[PDB]
Structure 1
Amino acid sequence: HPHLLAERISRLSSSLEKGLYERSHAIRLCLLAALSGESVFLLGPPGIAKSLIARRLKFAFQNARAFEYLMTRFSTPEEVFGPLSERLTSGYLPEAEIVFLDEIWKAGPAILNTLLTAINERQFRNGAHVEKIPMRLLVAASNELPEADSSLEALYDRMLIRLWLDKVQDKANFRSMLTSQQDENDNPVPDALQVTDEEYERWQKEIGEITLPDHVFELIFMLRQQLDKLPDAPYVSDRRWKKAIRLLQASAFFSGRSAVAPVDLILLKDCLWYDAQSLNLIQQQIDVLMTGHAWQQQGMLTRLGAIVQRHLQLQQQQKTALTVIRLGGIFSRRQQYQLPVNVTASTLTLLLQKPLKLHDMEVVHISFERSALEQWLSKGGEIRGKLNGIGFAQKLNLEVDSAQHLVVRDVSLQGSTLALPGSLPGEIKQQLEELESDWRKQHALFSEQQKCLFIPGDWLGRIEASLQDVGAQIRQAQQ
């Protein structure tokens, strides 16, 4: 049942896009805020399809009312909500569903005070008491930006989505747009794709039931701390973070998912900035976060770089000697330490060059105990080691060498430098396949949730390029 919901939404927005080219980000975003109870703001020059999107989304319902109003410098509240006789609000805003308000940055002080109460509580005073408003989508467009210290910032800080529209730039998409025959006043939405009033009240409750994975909280909390490190970043209060959770839960709900997906963080690019200066800062930090901490992009770079450094170090170890390192600290006797990641076994064996006659017999390999080698090289004493891997741990005359080696002395005071038996090294290939397998696991999640309708198309060229860059580099060292 949840899988069939993503197909019905994809077909609903298909007819809405027919007639407005290069405006998929301004139409698909308004559908998410209408089915979840959010708002949206537009900005740009008058004439980039800003009022038609408010009159196009009403055809996707069955009981929607349009309201295209233009705020002026001498506008009165009695001409916006309805003149009083108690207020004749027949087809305006208190009983409408989708209202449009253009040039909102020039109304009076009484109009702004009424728009703040119709968003948080969906109520509006009517002389004495208040009443509910069945508003589903709130859209507002303009052209200029408000002041830095004014009373108009109380409404801008409450809106969620801040769309950034612009004129057309592509030449291929302008040919059919210049001579379009699609009418903007008909009903291109079929009668089978329109939702009813019963399905709307049920979807408003199932949004809050979406679980919040632990991996998603690690990216949202990190993004909040990243914005605090930049003094030029816009100030975001706790009210925006509470409404941002509903935006991500509603996006994955209509995409055939039951939990919050990490790909839903792309919609946060239009919910933090406020002007043209902060526009290039919010879209920049999210692009690094999505291509650095979302699918563990940088998490694989800190491990691949260590393999390249380790591959060059093993070139002089894989003829074969054994260099003993000195452990740190202030001690009287010059203590020695074993090898770290090179050897890990407990009863490993050690070879030798010139053979000696120990205990009146020949030997070709001597094995030492890891639990006994760490104590003799630190606390001192005498070491005990068996011969040819058999017998008991007999005592030997082992000492330290000037070139950091293991010289085994016998009854004739002869030297014998010990060494470890040798085997793209095996350690490099073992550590590389584990990192390469993690890239396929992170790419498998991205090769399933990319069909989300609420994702901009221009971001697919940057997220996929970031995953292919690591894959092209991890396959070069294995050549």
Structure 2
Amino acid sequence: HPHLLAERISRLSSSLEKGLYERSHAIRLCLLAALSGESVFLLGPPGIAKSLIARRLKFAFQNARAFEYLMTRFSTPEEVFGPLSERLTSGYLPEAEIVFLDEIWKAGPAILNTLLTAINERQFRNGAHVEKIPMRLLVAASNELPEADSSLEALYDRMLIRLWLDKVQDKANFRSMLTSQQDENDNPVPDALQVTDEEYERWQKEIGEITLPDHVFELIFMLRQQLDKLPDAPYVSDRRWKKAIRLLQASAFFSGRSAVAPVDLILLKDCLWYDAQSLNLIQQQIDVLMTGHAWQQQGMLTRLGAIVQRHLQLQQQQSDKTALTVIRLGGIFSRRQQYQLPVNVTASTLTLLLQKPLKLHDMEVVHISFERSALEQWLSKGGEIRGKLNGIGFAQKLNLEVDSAQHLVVRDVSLQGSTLALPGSLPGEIKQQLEELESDWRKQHALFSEQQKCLFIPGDWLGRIEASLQDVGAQIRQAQQ
């Protein structure tokens, strides 16, 4: 039963996207708020199908009444909530499933005060007695942003979803959109996919019953604390955090899941922001957590470095068994030319360990990675050689020289000798820790392959999650070579 619900949801929004290109994230977002009792805010220039999405959501329900109205500077409550005689509200707002209010940052104080009670209390002051309002979806679009010190900030703080719609950018998607024969005022949703009034009231009780795993709470509290330290980060109140769970719990309920999935954190990129300055900061902070602490991406990177550091420590400790013999060559030359090992070493950026560690460039080192193209010129012609420390940084100059027993001696600032050595041909302790970390990467990748098919997830975000998980698996496979 729960697995069959994801098929009906994926098929319902598929018919709604017929005729609307580059608007997939705008239709699926409004459909989730219509089945959960939330709102959605639209921002952009007038003329990007901002009013068609409000009229298309009424086709998903069996009994839904639309309401398109443009708020003016001289608007009166008698034209929006119906005029009084006790109030003739036949087809207006108190008895409307989907309402659309364009340009909300210019209404009067009487209309703004009455709109706040219809969201929290879901009622309306109808003269004497009050009556409930079956408002299933509230969408408000405009063009500019309200003032930072005005009465219009109360309605903006209560709107959960905040989308910034714009014009089309793809050239292939513009040709099919410019020449569209699908009627925008028809009914392209079949009768078998339309939900009834009984299914809407039953889903509202099952939304709050979604369990909250301990792994999801560690990511919400981490993202909230990260925004409190940055001065340029937007302030997120407790109302925004509580209302975001209702949209996140319903995202997994309509996708065939019983608990909150970590993939539902991408929906917060259109709720935490509020202006142009918060758009580039919210989408950047979430992308780091989604590709770092979501599927243990960054947690496994710091754990893999400890295994590499432990493998290099065990290799430099047993370096007394394998030395480094340099063979000589004859010929006629004025300088003592030396030759390296033939088939024993063939890598270009090979690494060479050392016995007693020294202090080079005011830092410690355990292995010096040399270059095969520069080692042949120093052992024959001579001069100076370069080399990076710990396989990182720039190729710094070292005090490399030959020894009496055909060995390489690296000196520092105190004239301390150190014989170099090459690593031999995997210990049991390193293989045990690498096998446990590889099993955790396969278990984390299996969870992403079982929840990425969500309808409320953008398509371009899937390329970054897969690339972040493959980079961790590619680094752990190189250490076991």
Query: What's the CA shift string for 1:372-422, capped at 9, x where partnerless?
Result: 999999999999999999999999999999999999999999999999999
Of 328-337 and 266-275, deviating more is: 328-337
Name 2:472's counterpart in structure 1.
Answer: 470
Of 363-372 and 188-197, deviating more is: 363-372
CA distance in 1, matches of 2:393, 2:72: 101
Q: CA deviation at 1:310?
A: 2.3
Query: What's the CA shift string for 1:188-210, capped at 9, x where partnerless?
Result: 10000001111111111111111
Query: What's the CA shift string for 1:247-292, capped at 9, x where partnerless?
Result: 1110000000011111111101111111000111111111111111
Q: CA deviation at 1:473?
A: 1.7
CA distance in 1, matches of 2:48, 2:289: 31
CA distance in 1, matches of 2:45, 2:129: 40
Is the CA contact 2:353–2:421 (under 8 Å) kept in the aligned structure 1? Answer: yes
CA distance in 2, matches of 1:18, 1:212: 35
Of 446-455 and 315-324, deviating more is: 315-324
Secondary structure at the counterpart of residue 378 of structure 1: coil
CA distance in 1, matches of 2:47, 2:362: 102
Residues 332 and 34 (structure 1), Cα distance of their counterparts in 2 relative to 1, 3 Å cut: farther
Secondary structure at the counterpart of residue 307 of structure 1: helix
Residues 73 and 424 (structure 1), Cα distance of their counterparts in 2 relative to 1, 3 Å cut: same
TM-score norm. by structure 2 comes to: 0.78
Name 2:448's counterpart in structure 1.
Answer: 446
CA distance in 1, matches of 2:388, 2:193: 82
Of 256-265 and 300-309, deviating more is: 300-309
Name 2:433's counterpart in structure 1.
Answer: 431
Residues 406 and 201 (structure 1), Cα distance of their counterparts in 2 relative to 1, 3 Å cut: same
Alignment length (residue pairs): 479
Residues 41 and 336 (structure 1), Cα distance of their counterparts in 2 relative to 1, 3 Å cut: farther
Residues 201 and 379 (structure 1), Cα distance of their counterparts in 2 relative to 1, 3 Å cut: farther
Name 1:69's counterpart in structure 2.
Answer: 69
Residues 381 and 206 (structure 1), Cα distance of their counterparts in 2 relative to 1, 3 Å cut: farther
Residues 391 and 29 (structure 1), Cα distance of their counterparts in 2 relative to 1, 3 Å cut: closer
Q: Which runs of 5+ in 1 are unaligned?
A: none
Kindly name which structure, 1 or 2, has the bigger radius of gyration based on alpha carbons.
1
Percent identity reads 100
Is the CA contact 2:316–2:355 (under 8 Å) kept in the aligned structure 1? Answer: no
Residues 269 and 382 (structure 1), Cα distance of their counterparts in 2 relative to 1, 3 Å cut: closer
CA distance in 1, matches of 2:282, 2:363: 76
Q: Which runs of 5+ in 2 are unaligned?
A: none
Q: CA deviation at 1:104?
A: 0.6
Root-mean-square deviation over aligned CA pairs:
13.6
Is the CA contact 2:329–2:337 (under 8 Å) kept in the aligned structure 1? Answer: yes
Of 341-350 and 376-385, deviating more is: 376-385
Secondary structure at the counterpart of residue 277 of structure 1: helix
Query: What's the CA shift string for 1:421-451, capped at 9, x where partnerless?
Result: 9993332222212111111100000011011
CA distance in 2, matches of 1:269, 1:132: 32
Residues 329 and 308 (structure 1), Cα distance of their counterparts in 2 relative to 1, 3 Å cut: farther
Of 107-116 and 311-320, deviating more is: 311-320
Q: CA deviation at 1:187?
A: 0.7
Residues 174 and 364 (structure 1), Cα distance of their counterparts in 2 relative to 1, 3 Å cut: closer
Q: CA deviation at 1:163?
A: 0.9
Query: What's the CA shift string for 1:300-335, capped at 9, x where partnerless?
Result: 010111222222222233339999999999999999
Q: CA deviation at 1:358?
A: 45
Of 376-385 and 96-105, deviating more is: 376-385
Q: CA deviation at 1:357?
A: 42
Residues 397 and 240 (structure 1), Cα distance of their counterparts in 2 relative to 1, 3 Å cut: closer
CA distance in 2, matches of 1:309, 1:62: 64
Query: What's the CA shift string for 1:116-172, capped at 9, x where partnerless?
Result: 110001111111232100110000100000111111000000010001211100001
Secondary structure at the counterpart of residue 338 of structure 2: coil
CA distance in 2, matches of 1:176, 1:386: 55
| Matches for 1:282-431 after TM superposition, within 5 Å | 282-318=282-318, 319=321, 424-431=426-433
Of 424-433 and 160-169, deviating more is: 424-433
CA distance in 2, matches of 1:308, 1:144: 53
CA distance in 1, matches of 2:390, 2:144: 88
TM-score norm. by structure 1 comes to: 0.78
Secondary structure at the counterpart of residue 291 of structure 2: helix
Is the CA contact 2:94–2:124 (under 8 Å) kept in the aligned structure 1? Answer: yes
CA distance in 2, matches of 1:376, 1:263: 54
CA distance in 1, matches of 2:435, 2:211: 33
Name 2:166's counterpart in structure 1.
Answer: 166
Residues 259 and 332 (structure 1), Cα distance of their counterparts in 2 relative to 1, 3 Å cut: farther
CA distance in 2, matches of 1:448, 1:255: 11
